[PDB]
Ligand binder design. Structure first.
Ligand SMILES: Nc1ncnc2c1ncn2[C@@H]1O[C@H](COP(=O)(O)OP(=O)(O)O)[C@@H](O)[C@H]1O
Length: 233
């Protein structure tokens, strides 16, 4: 049993977050977050460490469940979808994506691609450089949770997978290849990402305090200005 039974066949990529709240015990880490992301936009989430950014993105994949509010995918509450369906519409790029104790190839293929299709993606992801050096190349086992790979290597494997999956929604913990041609929710750490984002959502203590484009936000001389000046970490 799961909360949802709906299997959306074709998803455009509109994501609606409304009145979203979450807490770890008595520590409220998200409070009434509301953001509407239209299909194809790149929305950058910024804020000091601990502002709730990672937790928000995890909630989208249902790695945690919100205490209040909703996440809609093309207007359908994500909890009404099967988890397999929901995740079929999402690509996650981070250092913490779950990897199977299996080969590089099978980790990329899971969820039908040729070996040359996978090699081509590894290169574009700049991942083939370490994968070549592996004992069995693309057929090398990467260990429990990809433990034979360090964080940056694991992220590059997630990129290769995203290049192939062509998911309508990309959740990226921080390329122009994907980011542009799908809906991108990016936890931004590069100045270039916020400078070019369609919308920036500024978080502070789990709350959205500012929202807009770089030029207007920078001029406001507020939290975003301070975050941009300090290098988004
Ligand atoms: N498993 C957990 N148990 C308790 N608190 C947590 C846990 N994971 C994260 N937190 C806390 O939730 C808050 C939000 O963290 P996070 O969502 O990672 O923010 P950001 O990505 O903006 O740095 C932080 O104060 C963090 O310590």
């Amino acid at each position: 049993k799961e909360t949802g039974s709906k299997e959306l066949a074709k998803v455009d990529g509109n994501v609606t977050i409304k009145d979203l709240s979450f807490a770890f015990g008595e520590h409220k880490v998200l409070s009434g977050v509301s953001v509407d992301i239209k299909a194809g936009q790149t929305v950058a989430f910024v804020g000091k460490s601990g502002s709730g950014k990672t937790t928000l993105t995890s909630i989208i994949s249902r790695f945690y469940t919100q205490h209040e509010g909703e996440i809609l995918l093309d207007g359908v509450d994500t909890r009404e979808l099967t988890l397999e369906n929901l995740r079929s519409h999402l690509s996650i790029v981070s250092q913490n994506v779950h990897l199977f104790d299996d080969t590089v190839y099978n980790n990329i293929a899971f969820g039908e691609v040729s070996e040359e299709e996978v090699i081509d993606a590894l290169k574009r992801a700049n991942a083939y450089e370490f994968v070549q050096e592996l004992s069995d190349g693309i057929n090398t086992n990467i260990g429990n949770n990809g433990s034979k790979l360090s964080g940056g290597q694991r992220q590059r494997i997630s990129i290769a997978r995203a290049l192939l999956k062509n998911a309508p929604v990309l959740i990226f913990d921080e390329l122009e290849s994907l980011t542009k041609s799908c809906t991108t929710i990016v936890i931004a750490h590069r100045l270039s990402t916020v400078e070019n984002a369609d919308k920036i959502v500024v978080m502070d203590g789990g709350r959205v305090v500012e929202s807009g484009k770089h030029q207007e936000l920078l001029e406001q001389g507020g939290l975003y200005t301070r975050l941009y000046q300090s290098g988004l970490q």
